[PDB]
């Protein structure tokens, strides 16, 4: 019974990312030996990819290049966010991974790089989405007790990745997630 | 006047802690100190922390009402509620809170 973290962040995050590439990977490799699985996601950008590729190759992980990304409310031209996972499926999600970190610098960038659900719509051939920290969409509009956002907001998503999409949990000593992951676990439930 | 059962159809598992307190006054929560005696006996809270929960309430902080959300439920599952009065008993407590009288 064995576990591959898809979340996780690297010191490529270079607000809050504290954990570096190398030994990291070794602790991945050394808790698990068997088929190693590791997902670098970092705070809307991908400095790490390739670094992150070939380190983790070199030491027998299997890499997942991964992008939490920011999330504008409605547009990206307008001037909070949003947190989204999201992960590469195969190389042309890899292509459409880079093409929405340019576009989150390029076009969306208030203060920080932020993307579209339309250009998400867009760039999601390829890509496994997942629904996120609590700072993510559904999660914060369980919080705000507007139910009928968090499931018309799912079923936008789901139009968009389709089978790709997925319910994030996770679980720390936070009473908010208790709620969320509740809410989640119904939402999860109900759509398949 | 004799002429309505204070019943408690609502929160039957929690009906035994409710009428002993409730009775006196006909099923409405009017006093603060009948908020910290069902806080303490449903939930299993200490009295002394009844009231720190009446002032949460009365402040009514925005996500640390949640804390004792989830407080509240650990305890009342524990004494015989299902999970599912426990939650909707905060929501009548956090209710009548605003309006409890010494
Ligand atoms: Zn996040």
Known sequence: ?192 | HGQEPVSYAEFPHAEKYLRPILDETYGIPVYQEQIMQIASQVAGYSLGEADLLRRAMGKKRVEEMQKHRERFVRGAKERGVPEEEANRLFDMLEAFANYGFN
């Open chain 1, 1 to 192: 019974l064995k576990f591959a973290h898809l979340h996780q962040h690297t010191q490529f995050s270079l607000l809050d990312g504290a954990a570096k590439l190398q030994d990291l990977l070794k602790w991945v490799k050394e808790t698990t030996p068997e088929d190693p699985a590791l997902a670098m996601t970092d705070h809307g950008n991908l400095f790490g990819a390739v670094e992150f590729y070939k380190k983790a190759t070199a030491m027998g992980v299997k890499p997942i290049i991964g992008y939490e990304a920011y999330v504008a409310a409605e547009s990206r031209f307008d001037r909070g966010y949003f947190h989204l996972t999201l992960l590469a499926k195969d190389f042309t999600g890899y292509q459409n991974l880079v093409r929405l970190a340019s576009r989150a610098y390029l076009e969306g960038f208030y203060e920080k790089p932020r993307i579209d659900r339309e250009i998400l719509r867009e760039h999601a051939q390829g890509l496994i989405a997942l629904s996120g920290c609590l700072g993510a969409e559904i999660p914060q509009f369980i919080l705000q007790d507007r139910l009928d956002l968090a499931e018309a907001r799912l079923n936008e998503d789901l139009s968009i990745f389709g089978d790709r999409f997925f319910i994030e949990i996770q679980n720390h000593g936070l009473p908010e997630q208790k709620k969320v992951n509740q809410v989640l676990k119904e939402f999860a439930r109900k759509y398949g």
